[PDB]
Symmetry: D2
Subunit: 187 residues, 4 copies
Amino acid sequence: SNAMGKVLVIYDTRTGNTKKMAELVAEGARSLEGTEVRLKHVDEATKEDVLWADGLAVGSPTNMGLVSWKMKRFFDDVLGDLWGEIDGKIACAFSSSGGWGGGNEVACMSILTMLMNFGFLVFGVTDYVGKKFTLHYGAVVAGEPRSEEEKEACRRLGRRLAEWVAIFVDGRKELLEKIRKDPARFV
Amino acid sequence: NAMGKVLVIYDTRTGNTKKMAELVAEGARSLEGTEVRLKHVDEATKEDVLWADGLAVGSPTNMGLVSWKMKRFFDDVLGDLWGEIDGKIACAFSSSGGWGGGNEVACMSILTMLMNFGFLVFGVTDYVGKKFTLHYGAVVAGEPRSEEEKEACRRLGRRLAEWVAIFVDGRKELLEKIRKDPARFV
Amino acid sequence: AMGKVLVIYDTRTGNTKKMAELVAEGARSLEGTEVRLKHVDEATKEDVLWADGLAVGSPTNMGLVSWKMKRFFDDVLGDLWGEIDGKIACAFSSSGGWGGGNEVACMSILTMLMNFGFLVFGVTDYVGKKFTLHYGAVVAGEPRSEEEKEACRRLGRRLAEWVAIFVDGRKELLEKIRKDPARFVD
Amino acid sequence: SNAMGKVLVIYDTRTGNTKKMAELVAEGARSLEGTEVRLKHVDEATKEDVLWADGLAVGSPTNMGLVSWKMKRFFDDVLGDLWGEIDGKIACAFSSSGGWGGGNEVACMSILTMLMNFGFLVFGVTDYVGKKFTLHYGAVVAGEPRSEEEKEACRRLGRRLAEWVAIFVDGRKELLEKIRKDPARFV
């Protein structure tokens, strides 16, 4: 009788790397039973997708340390009319850069700041998905997600997104403690 | 059975951020059934954070950033809870010496720190004066004296209480009421 | 006596343009400084190559540089990446409200500029009693007050000075600025 | 008239990781002819060191996404009295974190923020030091710098600082163009 959790994975990309991340995020979210997922490229996406979403993952290549101009334009110009009337959606960020130390966490930060501006509740993930591999401000990779931990970081983002949607909008209050006390979250 | 647990925790150099923190707490208390705990960092405990559904965290802007004492609180007393208190709701506020002085950047640093714990973090869209808002947290230069500054501080607490009510306490009817409320924009 | 300063800006409503004009004036106020003032639509990669120092201005759009400004950097100046390191740059921004993200927008401009290997800065000066520009000049709406207009001037003025000291080698200025009491109002 | 480069490398560390970075940052800085370099833990650094320096490299463990509380305490409480009168120093940041995607670029950003507040001219490095390895907001590593690229990112940070000190303070402007066109900068 409750609805499924509604998750939007929306991404820009230059080479496809962020698309490969986006697919893994989306798979991450679908893995939580009773979560529904829409996966869109920015040129495909509509203001109605966002209205539909309980939770959003927004991905961009790291372009000069920041969200891409096409993702920025979508928020500024397409979502601009919705601004002020869509507060309290849940959102996170992800990004692929040319290199480690190349600004993928900073690009994530700029996605998050854009999302916060719309009054969304934003988050990153504490989970260690590899011994030295995490996603505190969003899922980040240099190039394509190739390694097991890189693929898993992407999945974990969508997973946690779907879980926060499930806890806070669907009201599965019981999942909070399950997650907090789960030893698998730390490799 | 309307219910909610809010911690306003703050640090201060000259007391300006205490003044804000009192207004934040009173904004949170304005939502019926919301218990608020107001603490200086020196008296705050691990347990206050465990008790809270939602946190408002204040600091003076000290070189663009959270104060070292507030940083130390998070690094060293909350450090033991790191990894198991994910999902608390949190927001930020700051008093700086001046406009253009880094209060929004200090708010970013607070939010960075809270996100590190797995908290869901927000600012406020609401315009509280015609040219006065709080997108990344409540910010003032010096003491909150104008009615705008005071109301921005109150509003942060409100929205915090509201988000706890909607998302923790399960009060879904408030969401659309907030979204469509004309009074949110002066 | 020598300096090349480029002030480049985006504007939707005219507000940031008003700021840019004052930034430029501030830069010109320093003797021997040549200044170009360009909208992003008329700016070229040869402008950025000509410049010793840059002041880059955008409206605060969702707390960040506008998408038009971002396109310009990604698409036109992109080809210059890796070969223009060491240019000197700073930021400015007009937003809809105080607490609306103007320092964060500046941060995002500086982030972009640092990616080009630029040396990047803000200004310590108190141009008014509770008015400064630590991360760039910031205003809510149009710069109308005397503090606001001077905040913009001072950014332009400090860029010109950094270029005069660091490119043109006028080391004597450095200490003059460091000890100048006029820098802090009151 | 024979003035030269004064570079201070100031660091905090809790397990030694950032100290190992700091040592390599200092090695890198010393590689440029006529660069004098001080290397100092925060616990032993003074305000005289900061006054002495043309250039600074500031390093900290990534702690909750930010500079050390000890490093912060040193700027607020011992360097604060210099605020407003040391504008125009040249400075950069470096950090070691527990994991990739763990906030090291953000920690660096927080250091740069602090340094900018002092009126310093602040930078990162475009140079690629491995195929997918760079240092755009400062040198970053998860753990101890152990691989060749991780060690060379640390060195390169110190190198570029010394280079900026040489070009911008000590007048040696022939170097700008040599650095600007150097193919070695991109592995």
